[PDB]
Write a protein that binds this ligand. Structure first.
Ligand SMILES: *[C@@H]1O[C@H](CO)[C@@H](O[C@@H]2O[C@H](CO)[C@@H](O)[C@H](O)[C@H]2NC(C)=O)[C@H](O)[C@H]1NC(C)=O
Ligand SMILES: *[C@@H]1O[C@H](CO)[C@@H](O[C@@H]2O[C@H](CO)[C@@H](O)[C@H](O)[C@H]2NC(C)=O)[C@H](O)[C@H]1NC(C)=O
Ligand code: NAG
Ligand code: NAG
Ligand code: NAG
Ligand code: NAG
Lengths: 55, 43
């Protein structure tokens, strides 16, 4: 038994892509990851409820 | 039970005859209370 409080954690991933010299799609390492805002920050997110889901 | 933990934090194990919502104040339902608010539901 526990309290029922649910948190949805959404991770946003912005990918950068280019075309190489041989026509193959190359994914850039400059792709960005955004976590939900927590304590004025978007780089660290800790689960603080009893239940959570990730998307 | 009244618990005195490290750092002076006082925790209580309190049973009630009615369900108490989380972060609120008042078959037996038992709870762990930190500062008069329901911190953990035991069952
Ligand atoms: C990831 O985010 C960084 C930082 O915002 C982006 O790099 C900036 O891109 C803009 C738009 O072209 C430029 O004006 C800035 O000079 C860039 N900043 C730096 C420090 O290089 C980057 O484009 C993003 N990557 C994506 C969206 O794939
Ligand atoms: C819970 O325990 C703490 C820590 O021992 C108690 O706080 C002490 O109280 C005495 C009373 O004479 C003081 O001399 C100490 O300095 C206090 N310690 C600190 C760290 O402040 C507290 O009273 C206890 N709570 C109870 C028994 O309800
Ligand atoms: C997180 O994503 C879900 C869909 O997966 C959406 O319904 C929900 O509103 C989002 N939560 C945010 C953006 O805080
Ligand atoms: C930082 O957090 C404080 C509360 O601790 C808030 O008042 C302030 O608006 C936040 N600053 C930014 C830039 O988000
Ligand atoms: C719990 O007991 C109190 C005191 O008799 C009463 O007012 C309250 O209605 C009771 N709750 C339930 C759910 O029976
Ligand atoms: C505990 O609750 C009392 C009564 O409302 C309040 O005065 C006190 O500030 C609370 N303590 C903490 C640490 O939140």
């Amino acid at each position: 038994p526990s309290f029922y409080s649910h948190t949805s954690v959404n991770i946003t991933i912005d990918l950068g892509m280019k075309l190489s010299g041989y026509g193959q799609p190359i994914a850039s390492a400059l792709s960005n990851i955004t976590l939900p805002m927590q304590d004025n920050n978007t780089d660290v997110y800790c689960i603080r409820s009893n239940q959570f889901s990730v998307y | 039970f009244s618990l005195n933990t490290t750092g002076g934090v006082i925790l209580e194990i309190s049973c009630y005859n009615d369900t108490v919502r989380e972060s609120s104040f008042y078959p037996k339902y038992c709870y762990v209370l930190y500062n008069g608010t329901a911190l953990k539901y035991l069952g």
